[PDB]
Amino acid sequence: DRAEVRNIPFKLGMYLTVGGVVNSNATRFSINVGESTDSIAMHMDHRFSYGADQNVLVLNSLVHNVGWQQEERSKKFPFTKGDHFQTTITFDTHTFYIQLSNGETVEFPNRNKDAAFNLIYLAGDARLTFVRLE
Amino acid sequence: DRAEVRNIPFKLGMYLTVGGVVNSNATRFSINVGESTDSIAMHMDHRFSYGADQNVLVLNSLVHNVGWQQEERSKKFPFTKGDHFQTTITFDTHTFYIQLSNGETVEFPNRNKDAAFNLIYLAGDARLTFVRLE
C-alpha cells in the first residue's frame, strides 16, 4: 500500500532521511508527516505533471475533517522520473526544514506548532528504499 | 497501535537497527519481521515473565493461516525493564543474524528462504524510539 513508518515518534530535534526512486511516467508523489492519513502537518508533493503543474514542489497541511489549507510552492525541482532521491527533514515548533538531494533547502511553517508526529508516509508514483529516523 | 515500518522492503544485505525502551512491569515484547501480522518469518520475543518463562529470548516463525512453528530459545538476556535496548538484524537466504545491545549475537534459520520482507513491527510492552533500515 503506501510506504509507512507508524508510531515511532518523529520528535523535535530528530532527523528523518528517506530515500527512494521516482517511477517512470510518474504524475506526482508526496512525503507526508503528521498524525494520520487525514491529518498531515507537512505534505510535500512533487508534481511532474498534475493538471497545469509541471516540475513543481507544492507544500501544504491537511486538517482532519476540514481539508487542505494554503499551498506554498517551490520552483526547486532536482527530481527525475526513473531516478533516485534522498530528502532529510527536521523541525522545531515554528518551521519544517527540508533538504533536497542536491543540497538545496525548502522551509515550510509548522502551522499547528506540533512537537511530535506519529505517522510518516509516501504516497503516489514512487517507492521508498531506505529510512533513518533518529 | 504497534510500531510499524511497512512497505519499505527489508532486503538481503540491508541492516535494520531499532532502538527503544522496555516498559516498567513489562511481561514481554517482540520484534517481528515478515510479510503481515499473520505471516512472520522472524519473531523474537523477550520474555521477562510469561507463564513459566522468565528472562528468556524465544524465536519462532508464524505461518499464515497455519500458526507458530518450532520455538528456539536463548538464554542471552541483556535486557532490563524500564531501560533502553538496540538490536541490529541482517539476513541472507539461510540465516537471520541478530546482534543484541551488549554485542552478543543470536542466529535463527530463515525457514522460508525469503529474500525480502515488507513489514517490521514491535508488539507488547515496549516502545520504539529510532529506526535505521538501509
PDB file of C-alpha atoms in Angstrom:
ATOM      1  CA  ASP A   1       0.000   0.000   0.000  1.00  0.00           C
ATOM      2  CA  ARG A   2       1.779   3.309   0.821  1.00  0.00           C
ATOM      3  CA  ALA A   3       5.147   3.115   2.471  1.00  0.00           C
ATOM      4  CA  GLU A   4       4.604   3.913   6.229  1.00  0.00           C
ATOM      5  CA  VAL A   5       6.556   4.467   9.444  1.00  0.00           C
ATOM      6  CA  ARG A   6       3.919   4.497  12.190  1.00  0.00           C
ATOM      7  CA  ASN A   7       4.195   5.099  15.953  1.00  0.00           C
ATOM      8  CA  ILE A   8       7.868   5.608  16.115  1.00  0.00           C
ATOM      9  CA  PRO A   9       7.592   9.271  17.285  1.00  0.00           C
ATOM     10  CA  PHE A  10       9.297  11.883  14.984  1.00  0.00           C
ATOM     11  CA  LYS A  11      10.112  14.474  17.660  1.00  0.00           C
ATOM     12  CA  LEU A  12      11.699  17.960  17.824  1.00  0.00           C
ATOM     13  CA  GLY A  13      15.458  17.709  17.076  1.00  0.00           C
ATOM     14  CA  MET A  14      15.301  14.262  15.417  1.00  0.00           C
ATOM     15  CA  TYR A  15      16.134  13.890  11.682  1.00  0.00           C
ATOM     16  CA  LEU A  16      14.288  11.820   9.145  1.00  0.00           C
ATOM     17  CA  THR A  17      16.122  10.812   5.943  1.00  0.00           C
ATOM     18  CA  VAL A  18      14.138   8.888   3.342  1.00  0.00           C
ATOM     19  CA  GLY A  19      15.488   7.652   0.043  1.00  0.00           C
ATOM     20  CA  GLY A  20      13.655   6.192  -2.921  1.00  0.00           C
ATOM     21  CA  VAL A  21      13.167   6.042  -6.661  1.00  0.00           C
ATOM     22  CA  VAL A  22      10.621   8.034  -8.714  1.00  0.00           C
ATOM     23  CA  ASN A  23       8.529   5.886 -11.101  1.00  0.00           C
ATOM     24  CA  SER A  24       8.979   6.318 -14.875  1.00  0.00           C
ATOM     25  CA  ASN A  25       5.879   8.100 -16.118  1.00  0.00           C
ATOM     26  CA  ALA A  26       5.197   9.436 -12.656  1.00  0.00           C
ATOM     27  CA  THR A  27       2.498  12.080 -12.327  1.00  0.00           C
ATOM     28  CA  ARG A  28       3.305  13.086  -8.637  1.00  0.00           C
ATOM     29  CA  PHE A  29       4.233  11.533  -5.338  1.00  0.00           C
ATOM     30  CA  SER A  30       4.351  13.046  -1.813  1.00  0.00           C
ATOM     31  CA  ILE A  31       6.098  12.604   1.546  1.00  0.00           C
ATOM     32  CA  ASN A  32       3.612  13.274   4.362  1.00  0.00           C
ATOM     33  CA  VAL A  33       4.412  13.849   8.085  1.00  0.00           C
ATOM     34  CA  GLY A  34       1.529  14.009  10.511  1.00  0.00           C
ATOM     35  CA  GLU A  35      -0.762  12.225  12.706  1.00  0.00           C
ATOM     36  CA  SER A  36      -2.918  10.072  10.346  1.00  0.00           C
ATOM     37  CA  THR A  37      -3.711   9.862   6.570  1.00  0.00           C
ATOM     38  CA  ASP A  38      -6.379  12.627   7.176  1.00  0.00           C
ATOM     39  CA  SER A  39      -4.239  14.794   9.447  1.00  0.00           C
ATOM     40  CA  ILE A  40      -0.943  15.842   7.854  1.00  0.00           C
ATOM     41  CA  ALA A  41       1.159  18.661   9.272  1.00  0.00           C
ATOM     42  CA  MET A  42       3.590  18.676   6.282  1.00  0.00           C
ATOM     43  CA  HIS A  43       2.605  17.356   2.818  1.00  0.00           C
ATOM     44  CA  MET A  44       5.425  17.828   0.270  1.00  0.00           C
ATOM     45  CA  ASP A  45       4.040  16.962  -3.202  1.00  0.00           C
ATOM     46  CA  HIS A  46       6.429  16.507  -6.187  1.00  0.00           C
ATOM     47  CA  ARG A  47       4.451  17.277  -9.292  1.00  0.00           C
ATOM     48  CA  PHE A  48       5.967  16.134 -12.613  1.00  0.00           C
ATOM     49  CA  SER A  49       2.609  16.661 -14.383  1.00  0.00           C
ATOM     50  CA  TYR A  50      -0.555  17.259 -12.432  1.00  0.00           C
ATOM     51  CA  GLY A  51      -3.138  19.498 -14.017  1.00  0.00           C
ATOM     52  CA  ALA A  52      -1.366  22.639 -15.027  1.00  0.00           C
ATOM     53  CA  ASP A  53       1.622  21.926 -12.733  1.00  0.00           C
ATOM     54  CA  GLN A  54       4.787  20.604 -14.242  1.00  0.00           C
ATOM     55  CA  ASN A  55       8.003  20.160 -12.280  1.00  0.00           C
ATOM     56  CA  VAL A  56       6.924  21.962  -9.179  1.00  0.00           C
ATOM     57  CA  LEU A  57       7.107  21.210  -5.428  1.00  0.00           C
ATOM     58  CA  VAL A  58       3.890  22.076  -3.567  1.00  0.00           C
ATOM     59  CA  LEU A  59       3.771  22.097   0.246  1.00  0.00           C
ATOM     60  CA  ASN A  60       0.569  22.214   2.378  1.00  0.00           C
ATOM     61  CA  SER A  61      -1.138  20.817   5.502  1.00  0.00           C
ATOM     62  CA  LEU A  62      -4.393  18.852   5.683  1.00  0.00           C
ATOM     63  CA  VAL A  63      -6.554  19.421   8.729  1.00  0.00           C
ATOM     64  CA  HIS A  64      -8.544  16.495   9.981  1.00  0.00           C
ATOM     65  CA  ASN A  65     -12.213  16.648   8.863  1.00  0.00           C
ATOM     66  CA  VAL A  66     -11.521  20.133   7.442  1.00  0.00           C
ATOM     67  CA  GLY A  67      -9.232  19.843   4.368  1.00  0.00           C
ATOM     68  CA  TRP A  68      -6.159  21.328   2.725  1.00  0.00           C
ATOM     69  CA  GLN A  69      -5.031  24.755   3.728  1.00  0.00           C
ATOM     70  CA  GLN A  70      -3.000  27.359   1.776  1.00  0.00           C
ATOM     71  CA  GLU A  71      -0.455  25.818  -0.711  1.00  0.00           C
ATOM     72  CA  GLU A  72       3.157  27.107  -0.734  1.00  0.00           C
ATOM     73  CA  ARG A  73       5.083  26.327  -3.941  1.00  0.00           C
ATOM     74  CA  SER A  74       8.714  25.906  -4.822  1.00  0.00           C
ATOM     75  CA  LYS A  75      10.419  26.136  -8.018  1.00  0.00           C
ATOM     76  CA  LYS A  76      13.332  23.923  -6.786  1.00  0.00           C
ATOM     77  CA  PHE A  77      12.884  20.582  -8.529  1.00  0.00           C
ATOM     78  CA  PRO A  78      16.048  18.487  -8.768  1.00  0.00           C
ATOM     79  CA  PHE A  79      13.997  15.277  -9.429  1.00  0.00           C
ATOM     80  CA  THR A  80      13.969  12.963 -12.420  1.00  0.00           C
ATOM     81  CA  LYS A  81      11.465  10.253 -13.256  1.00  0.00           C
ATOM     82  CA  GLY A  82      13.065   6.837 -13.048  1.00  0.00           C
ATOM     83  CA  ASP A  83      15.786   8.210 -10.681  1.00  0.00           C
ATOM     84  CA  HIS A  84      16.782   8.142  -7.046  1.00  0.00           C
ATOM     85  CA  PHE A  85      16.109  10.900  -4.474  1.00  0.00           C
ATOM     86  CA  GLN A  86      17.113  11.490  -0.789  1.00  0.00           C
ATOM     87  CA  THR A  87      15.365  14.047   1.474  1.00  0.00           C
ATOM     88  CA  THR A  88      16.136  14.943   5.096  1.00  0.00           C
ATOM     89  CA  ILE A  89      13.518  16.643   7.286  1.00  0.00           C
ATOM     90  CA  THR A  90      13.855  18.133  10.758  1.00  0.00           C
ATOM     91  CA  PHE A  91      11.639  20.749  12.508  1.00  0.00           C
ATOM     92  CA  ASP A  92      11.351  22.952  15.560  1.00  0.00           C
ATOM     93  CA  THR A  93       7.957  24.364  16.776  1.00  0.00           C
ATOM     94  CA  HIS A  94       7.870  27.053  14.090  1.00  0.00           C
ATOM     95  CA  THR A  95       9.458  25.602  10.922  1.00  0.00           C
ATOM     96  CA  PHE A  96       9.981  22.374   8.983  1.00  0.00           C
ATOM     97  CA  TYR A  97      13.428  22.365   7.440  1.00  0.00           C
ATOM     98  CA  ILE A  98      13.735  20.209   4.301  1.00  0.00           C
ATOM     99  CA  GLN A  99      16.970  19.469   2.476  1.00  0.00           C
ATOM    100  CA  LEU A 100      16.783  18.057  -1.079  1.00  0.00           C
ATOM    101  CA  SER A 101      19.142  15.604  -2.902  1.00  0.00           C
ATOM    102  CA  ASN A 102      21.306  18.363  -4.378  1.00  0.00           C
ATOM    103  CA  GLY A 103      21.705  20.312  -1.079  1.00  0.00           C
ATOM    104  CA  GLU A 104      19.015  22.985  -1.761  1.00  0.00           C
ATOM    105  CA  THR A 105      16.611  23.514   1.170  1.00  0.00           C
ATOM    106  CA  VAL A 106      12.887  24.379   1.460  1.00  0.00           C
ATOM    107  CA  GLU A 107      11.311  25.672   4.702  1.00  0.00           C
ATOM    108  CA  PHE A 108       7.576  25.356   5.483  1.00  0.00           C
ATOM    109  CA  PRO A 109       5.788  26.685   8.646  1.00  0.00           C
ATOM    110  CA  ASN A 110       4.859  24.220  11.410  1.00  0.00           C
ATOM    111  CA  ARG A 111       1.292  25.580  11.280  1.00  0.00           C
ATOM    112  CA  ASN A 112      -0.052  23.745  14.369  1.00  0.00           C
ATOM    113  CA  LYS A 113       3.172  24.162  16.436  1.00  0.00           C
ATOM    114  CA  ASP A 114       3.283  20.379  16.968  1.00  0.00           C
ATOM    115  CA  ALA A 115       6.194  18.789  18.722  1.00  0.00           C
ATOM    116  CA  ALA A 116       5.930  15.146  17.644  1.00  0.00           C
ATOM    117  CA  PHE A 117       4.448  13.162  14.728  1.00  0.00           C
ATOM    118  CA  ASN A 118       3.427   9.515  14.685  1.00  0.00           C
ATOM    119  CA  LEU A 119       2.959   8.852  11.021  1.00  0.00           C
ATOM    120  CA  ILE A 120       5.369   9.361   8.064  1.00  0.00           C
ATOM    121  CA  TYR A 121       4.179   8.024   4.680  1.00  0.00           C
ATOM    122  CA  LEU A 122       4.847   8.178   0.991  1.00  0.00           C
ATOM    123  CA  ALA A 123       2.003   8.154  -1.498  1.00  0.00           C
ATOM    124  CA  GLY A 124       1.788   8.353  -5.304  1.00  0.00           C
ATOM    125  CA  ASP A 125       4.277   7.304  -8.029  1.00  0.00           C
ATOM    126  CA  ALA A 126       7.438   6.484  -6.173  1.00  0.00           C
ATOM    127  CA  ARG A 127       8.792   3.930  -3.739  1.00  0.00           C
ATOM    128  CA  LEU A 128      10.990   4.125  -0.686  1.00  0.00           C
ATOM    129  CA  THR A 129      14.196   2.147  -0.469  1.00  0.00           C
ATOM    130  CA  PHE A 130      15.658   3.255   2.962  1.00  0.00           C
ATOM    131  CA  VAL A 131      14.778   5.311   6.026  1.00  0.00           C
ATOM    132  CA  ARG A 132      16.716   6.676   9.043  1.00  0.00           C
ATOM    133  CA  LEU A 133      14.686   8.322  11.830  1.00  0.00           C
ATOM    134  CA  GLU A 134      16.857   9.168  14.858  1.00  0.00           C
TER     135      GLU A 134
ATOM    136  CA  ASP B   1      -1.047   0.805  17.921  1.00  0.00           C
ATOM    137  CA  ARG B   2       2.121  -1.294  17.335  1.00  0.00           C
ATOM    138  CA  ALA B   3       5.153   0.466  15.989  1.00  0.00           C
ATOM    139  CA  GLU B   4       5.378  -0.410  12.215  1.00  0.00           C
ATOM    140  CA  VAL B   5       7.644   0.068   9.201  1.00  0.00           C
ATOM    141  CA  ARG B   6       5.575  -1.113   6.232  1.00  0.00           C
ATOM    142  CA  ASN B   7       6.432  -1.439   2.522  1.00  0.00           C
ATOM    143  CA  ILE B   8       9.924  -0.194   2.700  1.00  0.00           C
ATOM    144  CA  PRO B   9      11.472  -3.545   1.590  1.00  0.00           C
ATOM    145  CA  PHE B  10      13.977  -5.128   4.091  1.00  0.00           C
ATOM    146  CA  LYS B  11      16.129  -6.993   1.556  1.00  0.00           C
ATOM    147  CA  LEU B  12      19.151  -9.351   1.611  1.00  0.00           C
ATOM    148  CA  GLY B  13      22.288  -7.412   2.686  1.00  0.00           C
ATOM    149  CA  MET B  14      20.413  -4.464   4.249  1.00  0.00           C
ATOM    150  CA  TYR B  15      20.643  -3.831   8.035  1.00  0.00           C
ATOM    151  CA  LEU B  16      17.832  -2.900  10.350  1.00  0.00           C
ATOM    152  CA  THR B  17      18.701  -1.231  13.680  1.00  0.00           C
ATOM    153  CA  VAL B  18      15.831  -0.495  16.051  1.00  0.00           C
ATOM    154  CA  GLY B  19      16.158   1.152  19.430  1.00  0.00           C
ATOM    155  CA  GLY B  20      13.602   1.538  22.186  1.00  0.00           C
ATOM    156  CA  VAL B  21      12.768   1.364  25.862  1.00  0.00           C
ATOM    157  CA  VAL B  22      11.255  -1.621  27.723  1.00  0.00           C
ATOM    158  CA  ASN B  23       8.204  -0.731  29.866  1.00  0.00           C
ATOM    159  CA  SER B  24       8.463  -0.989  33.673  1.00  0.00           C
ATOM    160  CA  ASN B  25       6.435  -4.027  34.673  1.00  0.00           C
ATOM    161  CA  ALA B  26       6.759  -5.450  31.194  1.00  0.00           C
ATOM    162  CA  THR B  27       5.623  -9.033  30.683  1.00  0.00           C
ATOM    163  CA  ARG B  28       7.128  -9.473  27.103  1.00  0.00           C
ATOM    164  CA  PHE B  29       7.528  -7.595  23.867  1.00  0.00           C
ATOM    165  CA  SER B  30       8.643  -8.806  20.401  1.00  0.00           C
ATOM    166  CA  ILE B  31      10.283  -7.535  17.203  1.00  0.00           C
ATOM    167  CA  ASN B  32       8.648  -9.214  14.191  1.00  0.00           C
ATOM    168  CA  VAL B  33       9.952  -9.273  10.567  1.00  0.00           C
ATOM    169  CA  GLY B  34       7.696 -10.691   7.898  1.00  0.00           C
ATOM    170  CA  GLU B  35       5.047 -10.116   5.468  1.00  0.00           C
ATOM    171  CA  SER B  36       1.941  -9.250   7.578  1.00  0.00           C
ATOM    172  CA  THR B  37       0.806  -9.512  11.263  1.00  0.00           C
ATOM    173  CA  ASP B  38      -0.222 -13.181  10.481  1.00  0.00           C
ATOM    174  CA  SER B  39       2.869 -14.068   8.459  1.00  0.00           C
ATOM    175  CA  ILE B  40       6.120 -13.514  10.362  1.00  0.00           C
ATOM    176  CA  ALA B  41       9.402 -15.016   9.200  1.00  0.00           C
ATOM    177  CA  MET B  42      11.289 -13.975  12.395  1.00  0.00           C
ATOM    178  CA  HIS B  43       9.501 -13.333  15.727  1.00  0.00           C
ATOM    179  CA  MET B  44      11.981 -12.509  18.527  1.00  0.00           C
ATOM    180  CA  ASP B  45      10.049 -12.454  21.842  1.00  0.00           C
ATOM    181  CA  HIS B  46      11.682 -11.015  25.017  1.00  0.00           C
ATOM    182  CA  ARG B  47      10.013 -12.678  27.949  1.00  0.00           C
ATOM    183  CA  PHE B  48      10.527 -11.037  31.367  1.00  0.00           C
ATOM    184  CA  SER B  49       7.648 -13.091  32.840  1.00  0.00           C
ATOM    185  CA  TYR B  50       5.303 -15.036  30.628  1.00  0.00           C
ATOM    186  CA  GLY B  51       3.912 -18.248  32.024  1.00  0.00           C
ATOM    187  CA  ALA B  52       6.834 -20.241  33.257  1.00  0.00           C
ATOM    188  CA  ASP B  53       9.349 -18.181  31.224  1.00  0.00           C
ATOM    189  CA  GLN B  54      11.400 -15.583  32.981  1.00  0.00           C
ATOM    190  CA  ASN B  55      14.210 -13.664  31.305  1.00  0.00           C
ATOM    191  CA  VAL B  56      14.366 -15.693  28.160  1.00  0.00           C
ATOM    192  CA  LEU B  57      14.515 -14.859  24.425  1.00  0.00           C
ATOM    193  CA  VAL B  58      12.240 -17.069  22.303  1.00  0.00           C
ATOM    194  CA  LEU B  59      12.485 -17.059  18.497  1.00  0.00           C
ATOM    195  CA  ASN B  60       9.902 -18.591  16.090  1.00  0.00           C
ATOM    196  CA  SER B  61       8.030 -18.070  12.796  1.00  0.00           C
ATOM    197  CA  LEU B  62       4.267 -17.822  12.282  1.00  0.00           C
ATOM    198  CA  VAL B  63       2.894 -19.256   9.069  1.00  0.00           C
ATOM    199  CA  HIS B  64      -0.100 -17.549   7.580  1.00  0.00           C
ATOM    200  CA  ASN B  65      -3.370 -19.400   8.368  1.00  0.00           C
ATOM    201  CA  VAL B  66      -1.280 -22.204   9.922  1.00  0.00           C
ATOM    202  CA  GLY B  67       0.333 -20.960  13.180  1.00  0.00           C
ATOM    203  CA  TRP B  68       3.583 -20.897  15.123  1.00  0.00           C
ATOM    204  CA  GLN B  69       6.248 -23.396  14.301  1.00  0.00           C
ATOM    205  CA  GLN B  70       9.068 -24.814  16.482  1.00  0.00           C
ATOM    206  CA  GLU B  71      10.383 -22.328  19.153  1.00  0.00           C
ATOM    207  CA  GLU B  72      14.163 -21.809  19.527  1.00  0.00           C
ATOM    208  CA  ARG B  73      15.219 -20.299  22.876  1.00  0.00           C
ATOM    209  CA  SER B  74      18.152 -18.272  24.068  1.00  0.00           C
ATOM    210  CA  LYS B  75      19.479 -17.760  27.408  1.00  0.00           C
ATOM    211  CA  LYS B  76      21.141 -14.427  26.393  1.00  0.00           C
ATOM    212  CA  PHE B  77      19.050 -11.708  28.015  1.00  0.00           C
ATOM    213  CA  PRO B  78      20.858  -8.396  28.490  1.00  0.00           C
ATOM    214  CA  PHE B  79      17.508  -6.508  28.895  1.00  0.00           C
ATOM    215  CA  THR B  80      16.150  -4.533  31.820  1.00  0.00           C
ATOM    216  CA  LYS B  81      12.616  -3.300  32.369  1.00  0.00           C
ATOM    217  CA  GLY B  82      12.473   0.472  32.231  1.00  0.00           C
ATOM    218  CA  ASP B  83      15.720   0.560  30.147  1.00  0.00           C
ATOM    219  CA  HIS B  84      16.894   1.158  26.615  1.00  0.00           C
ATOM    220  CA  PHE B  85      17.800  -1.543  24.054  1.00  0.00           C
ATOM    221  CA  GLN B  86      19.287  -1.523  20.487  1.00  0.00           C
ATOM    222  CA  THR B  87      19.124  -4.548  18.134  1.00  0.00           C
ATOM    223  CA  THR B  88      20.541  -4.909  14.616  1.00  0.00           C
ATOM    224  CA  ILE B  89      19.208  -7.575  12.238  1.00  0.00           C
ATOM    225  CA  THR B  90      20.503  -8.665   8.843  1.00  0.00           C
ATOM    226  CA  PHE B  91      19.908 -11.969   6.960  1.00  0.00           C
ATOM    227  CA  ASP B  92      20.941 -13.990   3.943  1.00  0.00           C
ATOM    228  CA  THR B  93      18.703 -16.780   2.461  1.00  0.00           C
ATOM    229  CA  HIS B  94      19.625 -19.265   5.186  1.00  0.00           C
ATOM    230  CA  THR B  95      20.075 -17.315   8.451  1.00  0.00           C
ATOM    231  CA  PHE B  96      18.878 -14.252  10.357  1.00  0.00           C
ATOM    232  CA  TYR B  97      21.779 -12.690  12.202  1.00  0.00           C
ATOM    233  CA  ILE B  98      20.776 -10.704  15.308  1.00  0.00           C
ATOM    234  CA  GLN B  99      23.129  -8.597  17.398  1.00  0.00           C
ATOM    235  CA  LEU B 100      21.995  -7.508  20.890  1.00  0.00           C
ATOM    236  CA  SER B 101      22.785  -4.285  22.863  1.00  0.00           C
ATOM    237  CA  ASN B 102      25.836  -5.768  24.586  1.00  0.00           C
ATOM    238  CA  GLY B 103      27.381  -7.242  21.379  1.00  0.00           C
ATOM    239  CA  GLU B 104      26.176 -10.867  21.877  1.00  0.00           C
ATOM    240  CA  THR B 105      24.559 -12.380  18.755  1.00  0.00           C
ATOM    241  CA  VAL B 106      21.695 -14.857  18.152  1.00  0.00           C
ATOM    242  CA  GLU B 107      21.189 -16.660  14.811  1.00  0.00           C
ATOM    243  CA  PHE B 108      17.814 -18.083  13.693  1.00  0.00           C
ATOM    244  CA  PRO B 109      17.131 -20.016  10.412  1.00  0.00           C
ATOM    245  CA  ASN B 110      15.421 -18.197   7.523  1.00  0.00           C
ATOM    246  CA  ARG B 111      12.887 -21.050   7.364  1.00  0.00           C
ATOM    247  CA  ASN B 112      11.131 -19.974   4.128  1.00  0.00           C
ATOM    248  CA  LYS B 113      14.354 -18.813   2.366  1.00  0.00           C
ATOM    249  CA  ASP B 114      12.757 -15.394   1.764  1.00  0.00           C
ATOM    250  CA  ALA B 115      14.752 -12.604   0.243  1.00  0.00           C
ATOM    251  CA  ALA B 116      12.744  -9.517   1.213  1.00  0.00           C
ATOM    252  CA  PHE B 117      10.261  -8.503   3.941  1.00  0.00           C
ATOM    253  CA  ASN B 118       7.675  -5.738   3.812  1.00  0.00           C
ATOM    254  CA  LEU B 119       6.629  -5.445   7.405  1.00  0.00           C
ATOM    255  CA  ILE B 120       8.727  -4.851  10.576  1.00  0.00           C
ATOM    256  CA  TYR B 121       6.758  -4.288  13.810  1.00  0.00           C
ATOM    257  CA  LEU B 122       7.089  -4.197  17.546  1.00  0.00           C
ATOM    258  CA  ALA B 123       4.344  -5.540  19.770  1.00  0.00           C
ATOM    259  CA  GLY B 124       3.906  -5.899  23.545  1.00  0.00           C
ATOM    260  CA  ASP B 125       5.377  -3.881  26.458  1.00  0.00           C
ATOM    261  CA  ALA B 126       7.956  -1.657  24.875  1.00  0.00           C
ATOM    262  CA  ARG B 127       8.193   1.287  22.516  1.00  0.00           C
ATOM    263  CA  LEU B 128      10.496   2.193  19.677  1.00  0.00           C
ATOM    264  CA  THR B 129      12.436   5.430  19.704  1.00  0.00           C
ATOM    265  CA  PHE B 130      14.543   5.195  16.442  1.00  0.00           C
ATOM    266  CA  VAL B 131      14.987   3.033  13.358  1.00  0.00           C
ATOM    267  CA  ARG B 132      17.598   2.780  10.557  1.00  0.00           C
ATOM    268  CA  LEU B 133      16.812   0.446   7.636  1.00  0.00           C
ATOM    269  CA  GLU B 134      19.389   0.761   4.833  1.00  0.00           C
TER     270      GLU B 134
END
